[PDB]
Amino acid sequence: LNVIKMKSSDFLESAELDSKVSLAFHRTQGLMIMKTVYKGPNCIEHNEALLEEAKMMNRLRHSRVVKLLGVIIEEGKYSLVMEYMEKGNLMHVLKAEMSTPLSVKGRIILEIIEGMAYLHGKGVIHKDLKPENILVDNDFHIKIADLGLASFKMWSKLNNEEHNELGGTLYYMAPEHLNDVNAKPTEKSDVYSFAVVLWAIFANKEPYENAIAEQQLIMAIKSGNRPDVDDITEYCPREIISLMKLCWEANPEARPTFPGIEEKFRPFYLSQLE
Numbered sequence: 001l002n003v004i005k006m007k008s009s010d011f012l013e014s015a016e017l018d019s020k021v022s023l024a025f026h027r028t029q030g031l032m033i034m035k036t037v038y039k040g041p042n043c044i045e046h047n048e049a050l051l052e053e054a055k056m057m058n059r060l061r062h063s064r065v066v067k068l069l070g071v072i073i074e075e076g077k078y079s080l081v082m083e084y085m086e087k088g089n090l091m092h093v094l095k096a097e098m099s100t101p102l103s104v105k106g107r108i109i110l111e112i113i114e115g116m117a118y119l120h121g122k123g124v125i126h127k128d129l130k131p132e133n134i135l136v137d138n139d140f141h142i143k144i145a146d147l148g149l150a151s152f153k154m155w156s157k158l159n160n161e162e163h164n165e166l167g168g169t170l171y172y173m174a175p176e177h178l179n180d181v182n183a184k185p186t187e188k189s190d191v192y193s194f195a196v197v198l199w200a201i202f203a204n205k206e207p208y209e210n211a212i213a214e215q216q217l218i219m220a221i222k223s224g225n226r227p228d229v230d231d232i233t234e235y236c237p238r239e240i241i242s243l244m245k246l247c248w249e250a251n252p253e254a255r256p257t258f259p260g261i262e263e264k265f266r267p268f269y270l271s272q273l274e
C-alpha cells in the first residue's frame, strides 16, 4: 500500500515511447514500468526530499489515478516505478483496428470524470490533461497520469541537474493559457481539456488536422475556433455534443466543475449508454 524502496538489481528492462519509460519485470513482483529520471556520476544527497515527495504523491489514491509502486534511490540512479497499463494511452486504443463500442467509450468518459473530480477534490489541478495522460488497462478501465511529472516538484528538479545524463498539448490547452507563459492553470482549464478529449474519443483522432501552422491555430482557437463537430463520423449522442460545447466555452466561468459534469453524465450513461 505504501511506497517501497526498490533496488535496481531486482529488475530486467526494455525501452518505450512516452513524454525514458521502459517496462521492467521485477524478480518477484512481476511486470512494472520504470521511469528513470536521473542516471549520473554524482551521488546526490537529498534522498529524503525525493522519497517524501513520492510518499506525498502516493497519497493520491483512487481507482482512476495511476499508482506509484516504488522508487529507486541510489548512487547516480533515481527511478519512479509504476504499475503497467497494458494498452498504453487512450489515443492508441482509439486508433486501433478494432473499434471501441459506444458503451465502453461511455464508461471511459465517466471514469475520466471520476478521476478528475477526485484530483480536484484533493486540490490538485492537472495542467496537461490530454489523451496521452489517460492510460488504459486490458479491461479498458482508465487511470489518469502526469507523464511530464510536473506535479512532482523535486523529481522534476532532479531531472534538470546538469551532471545528469538525461507540446502537442496545444490542442487540449484552454485559450486563456495559449500564448501566455504566466497563465496559472485552474480547475476550469482542466474542464476545457476534457471537452477536447471528449471530441477525440468520438472522432477517434487528434483535432485540427487542417491547421497549417501553430500560430494560426493558436490565434484561431483564441478567436473561438473549436474542433470540428461535423468531422465526427460516428454517432455521438446529442447530449455529449452539448456537454463538449459547454466544457470548451470561451468564458471559463461558464464551464461546469467536474462534480457537476458527473451528476449530469452518470444518469445519462446508465440510461442511454450502459
Ligand SMILES: CNC(=O)c1ccc2c(c1)ncn2-c1ccc(CNC(=O)c2cc(Cc3ccccc3)n(C)n2)cc1
Pocket (backbone or CB within 6 Å): 016, 017, 018, 021, 033, 035, 057, 058, 060, 065, 066, 067, 068, 080, 082, 083, 084, 085, 086, 087, 088, 089, 119, 124, 126, 135, 144, 145, 146, 147, 148, 149, 151
Ligand atoms: C505504449 N506506452 C505504454 O504502454 C505506457 C506508457 C506509460 C505508462 C504505462 C504504459 N503504464 C504506466 N505508465 C506510466 C505511468 C506513470 C508515469 C509517471 N507517473 C505519473 O504520471 C504519476 C502521476 C501520479 C499522480 C497524479 C496524477 C495526475 C495528476 C497529478 C498527479 N502519480 C503517482 N504518478 C510513467 C509511466
